[PDB]
């Protein structure tokens, strides 16, 4: 497994490993424990594999959104920072490294999209999205465009869509509700419509991707663009007088970009959790520690309050932090994968005019939430089946039969359950259909529960019921009233 008495650290190759190695030198100097900083490739997928076998690095640096999945697999240890140390970091950064109720990583850096503008073409960037059309008409008269940014990835268009109410997953009490997606709400409809209106009025092109927008801004063809700190170096080699500021507002509300928090997690299988904690809290997450890493590679905005005030001297870094505070922490749950494809398809379909804004977002809401909504409905259906079996078994232990009276029927009328003018002996009934229990007086091995669910169940849903009860289910009548029968006894 992992050798005791040392620290193995994984970080991406674009992060400051030479400066991080210097922090390890000062740590070895003061403690005698050697620290090796390696930056191998494909570590975001190498870690969950290798750590499942109880191996890997002691500390892993990566964006916070993948750590929630790691925590679900039990690959990350719970960190124990004192309240005194937590106050050294911005409070909202601690929310990016939370799964369930526990802290599972140290926040390091903070990144978000910002508005990048050409100071020669536009010395005063606009504060609102609504004034960009008139700015484009004024700039097109001189052969320039107002704004070009990547429309192919929902990461870049989401700040406008979410500004008026859109959200990925509802965050309630440290937990994300994977059944609640805010893609088809009124706010997302307003944001996407304004984006589509910009395209239909020839202010932007629906085929604009990352490379086309970056090339146009670097050659001084467009006055503005939307990008993150990773693109600054390509603008510096272009030498165009550019600035970085807060994203424009939409309907009086700020744009809400997804916030990415570079985080350091401790391997649950590491025998050096105290060493990792000591290194991260009192060596890396200091003014000297972050400066050494930043001298090797700029971190952008950082979660440490004391050092962020120093980095904020760069107005580009100050703008990145400002847009991040006004944005939404990117959910760290693996259900975001279905969110990305759903929104990506909706934006592309609406931008090219293949669907209406309502039809694109209605499909995306389905593409992002329907499978998780059905998973809950199926589990509640199985909860009723186990409850009916439990109550039927409790009748045997005290009486001498199952149903007693021949048949029992549950049918859901208008909000309540009824047993039809005759009581026998709380079931949510997620599909509002009908339950019916079959048993003839005699024997001890003949219980048959038949269900007539209302609504509809996908093929992936019915197959979930075939993977749980084996051959104990015979699904008939796939048209009109579907029928599910289960033998509650083995």
Numbering used by the authors: 1 to 370, 1026 to 1080, 1089 to 1153
Original authors' sentences:
Previously, our group and others found that type IV pili, filamentous helical appendages polymerized from protein subunits, promoted microcolony and biofilm formation in C. difficile. T4P are helical fibers extended from the cell surface through the noncovalent polymerization of thousands of protein subunits called pilins. Here, we report the ability of two C. difficile pilin subunits, PilJ and PilW, to bind to DNA in vitro, as well as the defects in biofilm formation in the pilJ and pilW gene-interruption mutants. Like PilA1, PilW has a single transmembrane helix (α-1N) followed by a soluble domain and a central α-helix (α-1C) with a β-sheet packed against it.
Additionally, we have resolved the X-ray crystal structure of PilW, which we use to model possible structural mechanisms for the formation of C. difficile biofilm through interactions between type IV pili and the DNA of the extracellular matrix. The majority of the two structures is superimposable, including the four strands of the PilA1 β-sheet and the C-terminal α-helix (which is also found in a superimposition of PilA1 and PilJ); the most obvious point of divergence is the αβ loop, which has a short helical section in PilA1, but adds two strands to the β-sheet of PilW. This loop appears to be highly flexible; in the four molecules of the PilW asymmetric unit, it can be traced in two distinct conformations (chains B and C), with insufficient density to resolve it in the other two. The conformer found in chain C of our crystal structure can be accommodated in our pilus model with only minor adjustments to the backbone, while the conformer in molecule B would require a total rearrangement, leading us to conclude that the chain C conformation is close to the native conformation found in the assembled fibers. While the C-terminal domain of PilJ extends out from the pilus fiber, PilW is nearly identical to PilA1 in size (the mature proteins, without the pre-pilin leader sequence, are 185 and 179 amino acids, respectively); but due to its extended αβ loop, PilW is wider along the helical axis of pilin incorporation than PilA1 or PilJ. Like other type IV pilin proteins from Gram-positive bacteria, PilW lacks the C-terminal disulfide bond found in the vast majority of their counterparts from Gram-negative bacteria. Unlike PilA1, PilW does not have a two-strand anti-parallel β-sheet in its place, despite the overall similarity of the two structures in this region. Equivalent residues in similar positions can be observed in the PilW structure, at Lysine 30 and Aspartate 85. Our comparison of the two structures reveals a region of striking similarity on what would be the interior face (buried in the assembled pilus), which may help to explain both the antibody cross-reactivity and the incorporation of multiple subunits into T4P fibers.
